[PDB]
Design a binder for this molecule. Structure first.
Ligand SMILES: NC(=O)c1ccc[n+]([C@@H]2O[C@H](COP(=O)([O-])OP(=O)(O)OC[C@H]3O[C@@H](n4cnc5c(N)ncnc54)[C@H](OP(=O)(O)O)[C@@H]3O)[C@@H](O)[C@H]2O)c1
Ligand SMILES: Nc1nc(=O)c2nc(CNc3ccc(C(=O)N[C@@H](CCC(=O)O)C(=O)O)cc3)cnc2[nH]1
Ligand SMILES: [Mn+2]
Ligand SMILES: [Mn+2]
Ligand SMILES: [Mn+2]
Length: 159
């Protein structure tokens, strides 16, 4: 099974200038809980944005060019990325925009954080079709001293 995990600001913005400008520790904790001990697939730009391997996960990087770091696994196509995960219950696709576009048609589950924040951005999560997806979990949180915007964790499953 393939799942996508992402945090979206207003208008489905996910990034600006190869960065995420906000800081929401509760959402990063949610990301870690839902990805630990699973393979994670990311594109090369997202690899550069994170800047280091994510511990406790098999890190698989998509790039058309040879890899430059043997601490992670480098693959050249979607099918190779999936194969490199092996026989696991759940593969996590962690972006960015171009990668989300390619994996969305193959995904059964979306883990989305909706952040109440207006961000200028240059990268968006794909337009998906709402009728295709059922909300199976949602949890709203007001802003607090650690998290400066309100946010909503949602899990969608393909109908
Ligand atoms: N808010 C969130 O949840 C979230 C999550 C992830 C990322 N982001 C943000 O998203 C942005 C990065 O997204 P992006 O769309 O620019 O880039 P991306 O999807 O991370 O990376 C695209 C790169 O991946 C490689 N690639 C993708 N598909 C491939 C394929 N089928 N075969 C081979 N290589 C493939 C290519 O690398 P080569 O050019 O080397 O061939 C391509 O240039 C940043 O702003 C980041 O902060 C946000
Ligand atoms: N919900 C969500 N939030 C995100 O921030 C996110 N980020 C990416 C890609 N970028 C990043 C950037 C940093 C870290 C990171 O530092 N993660 C640590 C945090 C642990 C914690 O804060 O508790 C990790 O071990 O996962 C992960 C992904 C993909 N999907 C996401 N999905
Ligand atoms: Mn092929
Ligand atoms: Mn197999
Ligand atoms: Mn806000």
């Amino acid at each position: 099974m393939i799942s996508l995990i992402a945090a979206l600001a207003v208008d489905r913005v996910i990034g600006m200038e190869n960065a995420m400008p906000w800081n929401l520790p509760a959402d990063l904790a949610w990301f870690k809980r839902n990805t630990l001990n699973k393979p994670v697939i990311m594109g090369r730009h997202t690899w550069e944005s994170i800047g280091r391997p994510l511990p406790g996960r098999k890190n698989i990087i998509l790039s058309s060019q040879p890899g430059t770091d043997d601490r992670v696994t480098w693959v050249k196509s979607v099918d190779e990325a999936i194969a490199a995960c092996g026989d696991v219950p759940e593969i996590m696709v962690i972006g960015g925009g171009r990668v989300y576009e390619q994996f969305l048609p193959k995904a059964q589950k979306l883990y989305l954080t909706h952040i109440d924040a207006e961000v200028e951005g240059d990268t968006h999560f794909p337009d998906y079709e709402p009728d295709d997806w059922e909300s199976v979990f949602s949890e709203f949180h007001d802003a607090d001293a650690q998290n400066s915007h309100s946010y909503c964790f949602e899990i969608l499953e393909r109908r």
